[PDB]
């Protein structure tokens, strides 16, 4: 491919998006804080958007060229993370007003970071369109930075990755690999490279046990796990994996009055999203208890649910105490479970299921892609705006959903030696758990990176 | 700005490059291993390239959108570094033939990385156009990965950043700032967060003293410093800061038969670059000695220079023993020197200079940009191509600024700050030339002492 080819391709995708926005009188994305934070969920718009990102990344990459790509990458990339690190730890998102500029001098005194250094940090932020400088000596928000205003979930995501995942695990992954090999054992992770025998610590042990700190309402023991919970919530409130996409991937209303057992459901945020939109549904959120868990679970629980979402302490490897429920639901649980452990969990589900009225629903990455809703299956336009060679938009070796899915793969690899799976690998795994399992649906909304898989037991 | 405006801008810039390559019968950049590694150095082409990169980055950013930008960023960007870390530590660039594909199985056996994990690592590389998969189960190079084949300097750059700068310094820079504030003391850096007063370790002490390892022919003491020197050479052999750009930024030939004193000139690589192109020049490379320095200096030294480039052990803060030389030259030395230290060095140069004969040349970032070479239609906006708040040369300038900030609390300067600093060293100093080739982030500043 050439620069010109990429540019033409880009133009084609922009035209699809730009025409949809105009024909529907929808505001255009910009870098201003009042920009829409996403494009319409229309499947044609989203396919075009995913291809556009991919081609624009290819274009900047090609134009930088082979001589400067590795040179500039190892110089600059790491400092985009460092910039966000400063922005979060100094609370700079909240200190810059959303709709008004602020001087470096005033910003410096608000956050306690000297003017010279502040100026330097902000300048790097500008190059990735986080904040801008509208006039000399002044800082203002962009859309990218404004979305973090007042949102500790956004800051949780920054700090979890920069203060835990990267320094403790991913920076050490090479060493981990050479020491223990290609492992599925969560002990074979960065913090244990020099641990004495029997003194290894698991990621989730560190998260729940460390008591030297505090985060967003939880002081002491488990503050890191609470922050990790915030990150989970962050991915549900907006963007590609937004929780409301679950409502489009399965007919929750069709269940009628029914009980959903939410196994490994964190703090029940996703359960609350589904139950808010489906008044006939009861959710049992099953999770390992913590000293602060119930206090936080009920503080977040919307009163409008009238108690339909409740918490039940439960070990996911143990016997399932809720028998004959309509749905047993696991959202992004099994990608941290190697085969033997996932089979244990699945067999616990099977024993509690009534094969003639229970379903097992999982939400997880399907590496090679799920299927779109039936209404989006037929391609009604041109292939250029819908597919990249043989791959659905967003997939293939340079696809942005492919990229994100590898990012998630690497994250669970880093912290627990987890891994993502293809559809065939999911079906193989479930049938090893019980040969009666059948994949009845595998729905991935366009622009999402996860699929909702509907499993049943048939004779 | 909107998606359509960005796309429109991109088309214009592309057209400039596309037209020039066609009209000059020059191969088009692609991702194939045989692609040109850079665009032509013609100033109009480079201006369009810099704007094109900037607009294309704006376009991918805007298309990702505000909801997904921070979410995707903190998920993915760190693993682009981790992928390069695997590729370097397992020597995968060399393991994959430049012009043939290799199966994951065969690559796995060559590098000793299990197949499943190998596949996973390679797949992340593909998304940034490092390697590709031309057929199921097979790996091939791209232009981006092929440039690292057989080049330990590229591996040096990967490992210096990922195994030293990032974990020891930049990841700890917030903690360092909260502990010491906006310090300019090189002891007030990440490794010393819990050091006893007086027991702080300097970055360059760690570099020259650590003996637990080896790198590219240097075993034991100072292997890290030798690898650092490889990274400096890496930025001289190609890309934006290539040493041959120095030949366009100053009239070296106009010096005639002349001596250049190269203060802090590393292992003399840059000196050799200039001396190979200018046969009438003699270079004196002044640098702090190391047990392996002279061996490595002479191994590297091109035979065809016939001794014109020599090594003189020297403390840059000490009296300058070469009096009256035509040129005293410092390349990317002063951006690691706070004002007081820089003034000490500059006054050592002034004492040795003949004001009517000697020049002082410095190569450094000028944060607000130098002037184009003399040999190079209408201007819109406040900034030359590559500069301004989203410019890609600005971005590289800041990355370098942050690099020296991280390891020694150094900093980059504007042209006005340079002039102020030099005039504080000696009021006779005058900036006679400040030349920055288009596509380069550094400028060559020519200083003289005037009455
Ligand atoms: C399939 C999508 C799942 C949404 C999650 C936010 C992905 C994220 C990588 C994740 O699972 C993490 C994790 O499991 C453990 C530690 N740190 C994480 O970030
Ligand atoms: C102005 C351009 C200079 C070219 C250099 C390769 C820049 C690079 C950031 C650098 O100076 C480094 C340094 O001084 C010390 C440690 N590690 C570095 O990387």
Report what the structure shows:
The structure is a homodimer. In chain A, strand 5, helix 12 (269-277) and strand 6 (281-287) form a beta-alpha-beta unit. Chain A contains 16 helices and 13 strands. With 459 residues, the first copy, chain A, is of the alpha/beta class. The first copy, chain A, has a 7-stranded mixed β-sheet with strand order 7-6-5-8-9-13-12, with helices on both faces. A two-stranded antiparallel ribbon of chain A has the order 1-2. Chain A has a domain at 67-147: Orthogonal Bundle (Arc Repressor Mutant, subunit A). The longest helix of chain A is centred in the N-terminal third of the chain and has 47 residues, at 43-89. Chain A is globular. Helices cover 45% and strands 12% of the residues of chain A. Chains A and B meet through helix 1, helix 2, helix 5, helix 6 and helix 7 of A and helix 1, helix 2, helix 5, helix 6 and helix 7 of B. The structure holds the ligand C/C=C/C[C@H](C)C[C@H](C)C(=O)c1c(O)cc[nH]c1=O (2 copies). One ligand F56 is lined by residues 228, 231-232, 235, 241, 332, 336, 365, 400, 403-404, 407, 442 of chain B.
Strand/helix succession of chain A: HHHEHHEHHHHEEHHEHEHEEHEEEHHEE
Number of strands of chain A: 13
- The DSSP helix count of chain A reads 16
Specify Rg of chain A, calculated over alpha carbons: 23 Å
Q: Work out the largest interface and the residue count of each chain.
A: A-B, 111 and 112 residues
Q: Using the coordinates shown, work out and report the CATH topology of the domain at 67-147 in chain A.
A: Arc Repressor Mutant, subunit A
Strand content of chain A: 5-15%
Helix content of chain A: 40-55%
CATH architecture of the domain at 67-147 in chain A: Orthogonal Bundle
**What oligomeric state best describes the polypeptide chains here?**
homodimer
Distance between the termini of chain A: 51 Å
CATH homologous superfamily title of the domain at 67-147 in chain A: Winged helix-like DNA-binding domain superfamily/Winged helix DNA-binding domain
| Sheet/helix structural class of chain A | alpha/beta
Largest sheet of chain A: 7 strands, mixed
| Main sheet: strand order of chain A | 7-6-5-8-9-13-12
Cα shape of chain A:
globular
Give the ligands present: the ligand C/C=C/C[C@H](C)C[C@H](C)C(=O)c1c(O)cc[nH]c1=O
* CATH structural class of the domain at 67-147 in chain A: Mainly Alpha
């Amino acid at each position: 491919v050439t620069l010109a080819e990429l540019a033409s391709d880009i133009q084609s995708q922009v035209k699809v998006i730009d025409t949809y926005l105009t024909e529907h009188n929808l505001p255009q994305p910009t870098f201003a804080p009042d920009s829409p934070r996403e494009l319409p969920l229309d499947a044609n718009v989203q396919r075009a958007r995913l291809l556009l990102i991919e081609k624009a990344m290819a274009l900047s990459n090609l134009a930088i060229g082979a001589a400067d790509n590795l040179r500039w990458h190892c110089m600059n990339n790491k400092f985009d993370d460092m910039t966000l690190h400063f922005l979060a730890r100094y609370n700079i998102f909240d200190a810059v007003p959303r709709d008004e500029p602020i001087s470096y001098a005033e910003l410096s005194k608000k956050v306690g970071l000297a003017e010279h250094r502040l100026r330097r940090i902000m300048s790097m932020a500008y190059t990735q369109h986080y904040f801008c400088t509208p006039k000399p000596g002044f800082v203002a928000h962009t859309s990218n930075s404004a979305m973090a205003i007042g949102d500790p979930l956004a800051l949780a995501w920054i700090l979890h990755n920069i203060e835990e995942v990267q320094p403790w695990y991913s920076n050490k992954l090479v060493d981990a690999t050479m020491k223990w090999g290609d492992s599925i054992d969560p002990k074979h992770t960065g913090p244990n490279l020099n641990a004495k025998p029997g003194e290894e610590k698991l990621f989730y042990e560190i998260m729940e046990e460390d008591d030297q700190g505090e985060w967003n309402g939880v002081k002491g023991k488990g503050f890191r796990l609470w922050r990790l919970y915030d990150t989970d919530k962050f991915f549900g409130t907006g963007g590609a994996i937004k929780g409301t996409n679950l409502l489009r991937a399965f007919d929750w209303g069709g269940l009628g009055k029914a009980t959903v057992v939410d196994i490994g459901g964190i703090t029940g945020h996703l359960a609350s999203t589904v139950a808010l939109a489906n008044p006939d549904l009861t959710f049992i959120v099953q999770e390992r208890n913590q000293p602060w868990y119930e206090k936080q679970f009920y503080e977040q629980l919307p009163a409008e649910l009238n108690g339909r979402v409740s918490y039940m302490p439960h070990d996911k490897y143990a016997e399932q105490p809720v028998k004959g429920a309509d749905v047993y639901f696991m959202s992004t649980v099994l990608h941290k479970e190697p085969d033997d452990k996932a089979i244990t969990i699945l067999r616990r589900c099977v024993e509690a299921m009534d094969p003639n009225k229970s379903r097992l629903l999982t939400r997880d990455i399907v590496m090679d892609g799920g299927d779109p809703p039936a209404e989006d299956a037929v391609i009604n336009g041109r292939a250029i705006n819908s597919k990249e060679g043989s791959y659905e938009a967003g997939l293939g070796p340079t696809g942005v959903i492919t990229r994100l899915n590898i990012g998630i793969d690497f994250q669970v690899l880093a912290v627990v030696n987890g891994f993502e799976r293809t559809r065939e690998e999911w079906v193989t795994l479930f049938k090893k758990a019980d040969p009666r399992f059948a994949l009845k649906g595998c729905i991935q909304t366009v622009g999402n990176c996860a699929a909702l898989m509907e499993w049943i037991l048939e004779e």
